[PDB]
Design a protein around this nucleic acid. Sequence first.
DNA 1: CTTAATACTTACATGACAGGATGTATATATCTGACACGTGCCTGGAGACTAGGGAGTAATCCCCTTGGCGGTTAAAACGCGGGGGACAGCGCGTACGTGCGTTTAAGCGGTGCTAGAGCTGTCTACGACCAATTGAGCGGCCTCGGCACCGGGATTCTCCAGTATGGCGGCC
DNA 2: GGCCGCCATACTGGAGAATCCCGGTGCCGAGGCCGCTCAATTGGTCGTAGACAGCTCTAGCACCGCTTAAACGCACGTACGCGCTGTCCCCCGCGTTTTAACCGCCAAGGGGATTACTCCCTAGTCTCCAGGCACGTGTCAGATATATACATCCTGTCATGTAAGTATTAAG
Lengths: 83, 83, 109, 109, 95, 95, 97, 97, 75
Amino acid sequence: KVLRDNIQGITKPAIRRLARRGGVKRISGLIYEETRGVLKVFLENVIRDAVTYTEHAKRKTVTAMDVVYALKRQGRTLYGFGG
Amino acid sequence: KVLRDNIQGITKPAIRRLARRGGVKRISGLIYEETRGVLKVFLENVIRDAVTYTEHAKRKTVTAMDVVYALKRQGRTLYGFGG
Amino acid sequence: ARAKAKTRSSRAGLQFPVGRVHRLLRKGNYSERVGAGAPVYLAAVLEYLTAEILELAGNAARDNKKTRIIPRHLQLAIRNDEELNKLLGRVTIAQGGVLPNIQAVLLPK
Amino acid sequence: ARAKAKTRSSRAGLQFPVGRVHRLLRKGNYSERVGAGAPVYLAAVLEYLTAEILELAGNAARDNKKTRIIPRHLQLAIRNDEELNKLLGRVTIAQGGVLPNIQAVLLPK
Amino acid sequence: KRSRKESYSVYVYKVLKQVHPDTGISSKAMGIMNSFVNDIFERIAGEASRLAHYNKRSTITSREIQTAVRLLLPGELAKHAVSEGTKAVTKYTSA
Amino acid sequence: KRSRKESYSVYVYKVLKQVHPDTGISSKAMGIMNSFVNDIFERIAGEASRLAHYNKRSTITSREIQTAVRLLLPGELAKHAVSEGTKAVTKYTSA
Amino acid sequence: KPHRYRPGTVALREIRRYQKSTELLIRKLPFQRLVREIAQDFKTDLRFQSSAVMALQEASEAYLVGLFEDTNLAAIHAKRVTIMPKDIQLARRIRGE
Amino acid sequence: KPHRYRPGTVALREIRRYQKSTELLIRKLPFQRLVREIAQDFKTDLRFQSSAVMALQEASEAYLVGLFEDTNLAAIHAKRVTIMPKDIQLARRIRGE
Amino acid sequence: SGPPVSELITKAVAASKERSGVSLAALKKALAAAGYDVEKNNSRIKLGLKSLVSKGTLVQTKGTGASGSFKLNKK
DNA sequence: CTTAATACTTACATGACAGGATGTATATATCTGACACGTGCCTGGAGACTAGGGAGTAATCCCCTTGGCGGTTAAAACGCGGGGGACAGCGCGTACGTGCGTTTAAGCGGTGCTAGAGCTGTCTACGACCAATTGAGCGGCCTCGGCACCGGGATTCTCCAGTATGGCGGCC
DNA sequence: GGCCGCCATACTGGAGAATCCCGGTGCCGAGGCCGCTCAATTGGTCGTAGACAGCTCTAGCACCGCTTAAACGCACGTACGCGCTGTCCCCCGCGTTTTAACCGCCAAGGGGATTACTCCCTAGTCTCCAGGCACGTGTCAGATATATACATCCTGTCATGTAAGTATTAAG
């Protein structure tokens, strides 16, 4: 039923690969938890807006177009899922 | 009537005063002319927008409301000027 | 002949003009039709926000031994509140100055 | 005795639907009326921009020896044009990848 | 002969004298109040218009504005904002 | 069947064949272009609404749209878009 | 002796590869578990479209692209090549949050 | 001897004073001449409301204040007290200029 | 060819003899003033400026290894 | 006697503690103009009623999300090592930081101009609303070859071992 | 001190593998074809929106005249960035092991969406009254000015920690 730790499910090699896409070659040992924290807080900043949209839509199923609105509110305008 | 070299009209000690308001302890000699260029580009963008407001209004005198609109469309919203 | 009218601001018992906010919403091109609770809700929100910031400005003015608000007090009030800073991170204030803020390396010893 | 109804896009010789754009502006609530040349001009601007970006996409796909547009080609086309980069700096592309971008200090001797 | 120019003067004056009966007002601080009222009003009104578009509702009620407060206003103030809004709509329906 | 959901597929397809008769397009790129055209459409719409606000105009005309282009769109592509838009509204004006 | 690359050679090769690549780097289902976990931390028992989950994935990945690019710029400006959370905090502060 | 303060003492005194102060730090007349100069380069004989000129003045001042505090954040992140142009370039490019 | 750079470096440090010793910066600029290469041979100077501190003719004042200051021996 | 080891007196810098003086803050008189308070009005807000429409609500269904089961190996993860990184230490050429007089042009006070910013009547252009009509664009399908996936040889990367040169080391 | 040999490190050619480059091959999005529908359209029409015209009047523009504030420039001075190693430190490379992610396969129902129904709910409008801005003024809070008090920061001063020569005396 409940879930308690899935932020660590965003694995360290995944962060390594992302910084390879981000152009970072050497990634300090303190980086990974910092990235987990900032992705953490940013994901509540997203999902709070997205859910607030959703019960404003009176729905129980979260749509991707809600995510698009929540991102463009935060200046993170998305191409590839509109409509 | 023609104005030629008024970018130097914003004096170097005025830049030092601003850096004191910005809290800068030590100001290199290359800071001032770079600052002049950066503010030149910034205010060029702002005056481009605000003039475009002015001829779209079929006016000739630059008004402060157009200044407010031009600043806020660059995400630099200013209060106190009839906005 | 006619019932004697009270303002809808007085019906709410709020100081902000419900009618003026309602007409600026209807003429602001946001929706052609507007629900009744929307402008009174927004006006209550705005009055509460201005009440908070005016309280902060008043206490800041009493701190500086000044009877009247100044935009220096406004700058101190906005920049020293976290949620108001989140509201006004990108907002420029005329004649406000900045926070007294010196970095730790800038201080001697 | 109704005449043959043509289309405003063909009347402007263009491909974007002038009728759809004028409809969406009338029901998008941005003004009470829409000027006569406004949707034609808007559609012309949108089609010209779409024409450049589709030409860039096709050129990038041909340079990548592929005959079908993939979002990688779109990202490489958009981010390599300075004015479109200034248009779409804060815009997220799905599955487009990133520019090949390495700093000179990151490359070895 | 002149034309009237509207501002939010007397309302902010009333609110300040409610929270501080003895505190005075400078005019350019009042300009910052008028511009702040206009700015936040336009932000919330645009958000309400967007929410009305996204739910395909042609009518913006208090629910839309409540959503806009939940979005823009961060947390603790937004919770208090919902509190006066609920009490105000209750007393307005009772009046 | 279902209700028709309008999108910008066929027009992008035609413009692609105008600029590139030889190549194809993926549906994901199609959706990205629909997001592009909708995004820039709403940007220009909001800007033209703001200019109609500032000029107190009940109508957004091609002057407003040209103003919003030259505000939003940078430089030489913007003046080009002016040129083809001007040519388009002239040859539409001449039917 | 096995052939062994110098430090960073595989890292820069990965950099070139993943800049060339367009696919997602996060596992979809543990990410979905985290999304549902934080969702029920706000409202219990939400339902999520899978496409919304991949959209959150790619948005987060784009944010990570941006913030390591800013972080790498800061660390170069910090006269370093190993990035640190101080760089991330600095970039986070400069971006205005 | 005549009294003389060490480098930084008058600097910090000016820092606290101008953080305390709220007035404009720019000579108004050459600023007005410069904005007329730049706007003349776009369209001729352009006229300015003087209040709009002072509004541009404090807008420019506060924009440079934000740029300079970001610059000082970069400089202390680069472990320095003397700001240099790479600080401002980093601030502009990370901020998105 | 010429003489080894040990004689050159000892001449460079014996030219000045400041109370606070010569930096690696000041000594390499002094050797460049002589005309000796300091850019590709900086590995040679790099190993030399710890080999001489280890060998005891010169002692390091305030720095460590090849960093900081250097002064001549007591006798 | 010669010689040598140490300790004690002698030489060098360093930090610890007091004081002024001028800039900055502290206490007191003035005035002014701008906060603030009082008044004309007309625009603004709205009570009643209505028109008419959006929208809340029931239901259902079905499909698209949720739940479960077996197998792979992709991914996670753990750990040894190795070579790169990070960052202090210290010095040094420098590079503004800052004291100070001049100059001058900004600043402050005074005069005339008209550009144009903005109010008001016109009316003529303008563009939306509506009945109907269509045709092009969208829902659905269905083939197919460009692409997804698979397999073999080069290129290139890239490290790894063998040479001048130059610095390092030793004898007579 | 000269002269002569030995190895560390920069050059410099060689080998193995990761991925690019060439085929090969099946396949399932691409796009083309087909039915549908709604959406653009077109013209009357009807109300209405902004450009035009004219005026007007006021605030920026131009010009001027004292007047020192501030820029400028010069010049002493202390501190700043950072260059280069030194030295600890640490995180990728490699490799293996495990484990659940992925796949893929199947059951089942939750609510998303859709249609229907009937009900709220609000914009508009003629009119009516009421407050808030326009505008004028008038009067004390703070700006400004003048005399004090601390700040504070540099300066001046003394004790103290630390480095070093040879007397002296004890042993060869």
